[PDB]
Amino acid sequence: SGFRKMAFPSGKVEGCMVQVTCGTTTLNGLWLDDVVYCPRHVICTSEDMLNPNYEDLLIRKSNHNFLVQAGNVQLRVIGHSMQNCVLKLKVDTANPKTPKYKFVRIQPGQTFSVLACYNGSPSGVYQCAMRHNFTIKGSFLNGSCGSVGFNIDYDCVSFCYMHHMELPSGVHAGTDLEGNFYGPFVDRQTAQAAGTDTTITVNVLAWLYAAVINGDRWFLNRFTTTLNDFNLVAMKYNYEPLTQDHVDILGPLSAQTGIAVLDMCASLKELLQNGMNGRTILGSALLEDEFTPFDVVRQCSGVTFQ
Amino acid sequence: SGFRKMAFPSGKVEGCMVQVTCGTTTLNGLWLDDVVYCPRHVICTSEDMLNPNYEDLLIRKSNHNFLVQAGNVQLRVIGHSMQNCVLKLKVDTANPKTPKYKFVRIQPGQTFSVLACYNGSPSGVYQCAMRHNFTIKGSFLNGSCGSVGFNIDYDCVSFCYMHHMELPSGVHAGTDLEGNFYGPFVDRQTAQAAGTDTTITVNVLAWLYAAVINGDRWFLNRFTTTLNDFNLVAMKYNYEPLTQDHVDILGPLSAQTGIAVLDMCASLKELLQNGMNGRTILGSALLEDEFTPFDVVRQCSGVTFQ
Ligand SMILES: *[C@](O)(C(=O)NCc1ccccc1)[C@H](C[C@@H]1CCNC1=O)NC(=O)[C@H](CC1CC1)n1cccc(NC(=O)OC(C)(C)C)c1=O
Ligand SMILES: *[C@](O)(C(=O)NCc1ccccc1)[C@H](C[C@@H]1CCNC1=O)NC(=O)[C@H](CC1CC1)n1cccc(NC(=O)OC(C)(C)C)c1=O
Incomplete structure (x- = not known):
């Protein structure tokens, strides 16, 4: 009895949230096995954001420029690489709380739960749909980048979204966990418009x-x-x-x-x-x-x- | 920006959910330290539900009658006790994942997150308000009793609700974790109705x-x-x-x-x-x-x- 907009239990994903800092920028990262995934614009300064050359900016970074914290523990970064719009930070420790998981790219109309996180700490959970203009209607503030969207099937967490940016009129855009944006958007501080939305x-x-x-x-x-x-x-x-x-x-x-x-x-x-x-x-x-x-x-x- | 109905991250509570079986009745319990809290009507048959004499019914129960599973690990019940409408099962093993917690009685108009569970396994999370008629607009099916409602403050879980029953308007009623019902409701199979409700x-x-x-x-x-x-x-x-x-x-x-x-x-x-x-x-x-x-x-x- 009753019908409610309902998110998945977020415990399996809470255990994977870390904080990633590069220079002046702090956002969230996803810690699975010995890899931390986060948005590549963690390496940008506010000036870089307007038109960043990510490949060039990343060459200027070293493993130790990445400060990664899991609660009260610093994880040592021993390797790093770019995949599309995400960074993969190899760390010397595997996450003991890593759940069974996969990465999936979802289709418009499909729903998922978002664990909104700030400074590596989970803040709230809510349900979203990938709309046909490839935006989501989220609740995201400064610091929420790197929060992820997911479904749970039995014990297996399917990660489908990582948060990157805000679009006009309070909607949001991000990537899959391979760093490919949903929709025509780019991780750059420039004016960008979403297509007209439609009802699913x-x-x-x-x-x-x-x-x-x-x-x-x-x-x-x-x-x-x-x-x-x-x-x-x-x-x-x-x-x-x-x-x-x-x-x-x-x-x-x-x-x-x-x-x-x-x-x-x-x-x-x-x-x-x-x-x-x-x-x-x-x-x-x-x-x-x-x-x-x-x-x-x-x-x-x-x-x-x- | 953006504004969404948002529940608290549920992992701290997920680590406390267990399954309680007594005779043919299975529902959820809340495992904190070496005590499991659950609705007392777990000891009733459908025949008992008409006017159950909980004191007499419990006297006839053995610790062995209470089968408590945390995952695929059975917990040995070594003692039981009744407090208002909740049963307290003392178990051999203290919950290693017990969070810092309090038991609070929330006020009408205030909100909390519900972790809906079945067979001791979390299934979903959503936000509810305690209405002025002491009901909540939940989503609960057969087997959801013992699911709890909570708020999180920093690292402290304030448990405020345990689910007991559904009403003939599609809404729900339950107790605080001291076993006292919100509202005038009773844990027996009788005709019950939500009072008139006002907008908050x-x-x-x-x-x-x-x-x-x-x-x-x-x-x-x-x-x-x-x-x-x-x-x-x-x-x-x-x-x-x-x-x-x-x-x-x-x-x-x-x-x-x-x-x-x-x-x-x-x-x-x-x-x-x-x-x-x-x-x-x-x-x-x-x-x-x-x-x-x-x-x-x-x-x-x-x-x-x-
Ligand atoms: C994300 O980077 C983040 O959380 N970073 C950590 C941080 C940022 C700022 C201050 C302290 C810490 C944010 C998430 C944004 C913030 C507000 N709501 C969100 O969803 N992402 C961005 O700021 C994003 C980075 C760009 C893609 C690489 N960014 C930058 C600048 C502007 C916008 N959006 C915007 O201005 O939209 C309009 C419609 C023009 C108002 C943007 O997303
Ligand atoms: C709860 O006891 C429970 O989930 N128990 C385990 C279980 C039950 C049934 C089958 C398998 C396992 C349920 C929760 C209810 C069930 C459906 N949605 C819910 O929220 N609670 C009750 O059944 C409750 C027990 C009473 C308080 C002690 N109960 C009993 C009798 C009648 C009703 N209500 C009712 O009939 O409502 C209408 C709308 C008229 C159908 C009731 O909740």
């Missing part, structure tokens, strides 16, 4: 299934729709096209509720055309799009992790 | 201040109101009366923004009377009341825990 249709449909599962049924109508006719309306309201893959992905939820996917699309189509008429769904007065189909199943069926 | 006015104001700090400022206006006139309008909408102590508690956010509380109240009065005209505030189309002034200050100033 398959996620709205998942959340409408969550609503039915939790006893909110008032938006269900007696119609069905074809995929084409639905998308004609969806595009008029800045919704992402719904694909047959999306329909197929919603299958398990539609079996759980006895409401065919294209029937739910006909109810969504009516909501888009007529609005919500001042009524709420799952305690929201708008249509929510940052719950994936899996998020809904996971929460409504009690999947756990250890 | 001081929290709505704090969230409007959060909005301004993050640059979402369209609802600000040049008008001011008296405290009494604001409360005349507020009371009609089932908002909690705003006291002078509330105005004082908002002092830090008022000073940060330069917007006097009675100036902000004129925004809130206009939003109550005329609605939002299809705009959002921090991404919400309704007025959010589950952020405390401290939650806003904590998030917008970036304080950290360890």
Whole structure:
């Protein structure tokens, strides 16, 4: 009973957070086995930030220019290397708290938990979606760079995001753990714009299934729709096209509720055309799009992790 | 920048969660030093739930009846005791991961993080407010009882909630860690209902201040109101009366923004009377009341825990 935006338990990732300082800049790093991963702009001064030549700047650095602290312990840096927009600092000690992990690049519409960290110390946890303009709607202040986003499957932590920068109107951009940016962005202090954002249709449909599962049924109508006719309306309201893959992905939820996917699309189509008429769904007065189909199943069926 | 509903990092609590089985009932317990805390109804059959005589039921229980697992390590129960609605199981092994902790009874209007667990394994984290009707808007399934709510101050975990039950409005009720229910609820299978609930006015104001700090400022206006006139309008909408102590508690956010509380109240009065005209505030189309002034200050100033 109840439906909440829910993050993964963050303990397995808390144990990996360290502090990385280079010269005047302190941010967070991720300590896995004997490697610390952090944003490469830790080597920049405020002047460098406006147009940095990272390869040239890094040649000027040595292992001892990197001060890495895990709580009250300094880790010795014995090697360093750049991979795209992240640095990899080899350290002489392996992290005893390293969880089972992998690095993944997620797709737009997929969600993950962010452990917001400052000076190597975890501060809070919240859920984010990779939007189709490759931004996230985060909560990030000075010092949060190097905080990571992740999912947990059983005991395995999949790291998918490392935080680098803020974009206009309070949204955020970063890389995967191989240092490749999500979206057309670059780690440079210059004006950069994100593309127009859109609503994540398959996620709205998942959340409408969550609503039915939790006893909110008032938006269900007696119609069905074809995929084409639905998308004609969806595009008029800045919704992402719904694909047959999306329909197929919603299958398990539609079996759980006895409401065919294209029937739910006909109810969504009516909501888009007529609005919500001042009524709420799952305690929201708008249509929510940052719950994936899996998020809904996971929460409504009690999947756990250890 | 950016403002998100944010839970505390949960790892300090994850290291305390265990599974407690008694007969056919399995739920979660909280393992601190050599004591495991869990809901006393773990000793009940469904037949016991109608009017359980907990004192008599417990007398018939052996230490051997209590099967406690921490991961795949069984803990030997060597003693048990009842305190109000919580059972205290003394175990052979003190929890090596016991954090610095306190037991506190939170006040209505205040927030805390819930670590939802099943079979002693953490599954997710989210923020809840203790409502004025002594319920919380949680997400809890079969097997979640014994999950706890907490705040973290520096390195001290203040445990304030243990989950016991769901109500016929989709909300939840439980105890403090001394086993005393919040609200008038009882741990037996009887018809129970949440009282009327009021909107937490001081929290709505704090969230409007959060909005301004993050640059979402369209609802600000040049008008001011008296405290009494604001409360005349507020009371009609089932908002909690705003006291002078509330105005004082908002002092830090008022000073940060330069917007006097009675100036902000004129925004809130206009939003109550005329609605939002299809705009959002921090991404919400309704007025959010589950952020405390401290939650806003904590998030917008970036304080950290360890
Ligand atoms: C990250 O570097 C960080 O946390 N660094 C440690 C630190 C920084 C400053 C002071 C003390 C310690 C920050 C994270 C930012 C901060 C505010 N919100 C965030 O998400 N990243 C940057 O500052 C980033 C670095 C560039 C990519 C390499 N940066 C620099 C300068 C400007 C912006 N953004 C910005 O100005 O956006 C607009 C829309 C123009 C306001 C930026 O992200
Ligand atoms: C908690 O006891 C628990 O999780 N126990 C272990 C377990 C239970 C069931 C199956 C396997 C394992 C549950 C938590 C509830 C369950 C679903 N969501 C929750 O939040 N608590 C209860 O069942 C509670 C126990 C009473 C306090 C001692 N209980 C009993 C009887 C009735 C209700 N409520 C209820 O019927 O609510 C409605 C909305 C009317 C369905 C109740 O919580």
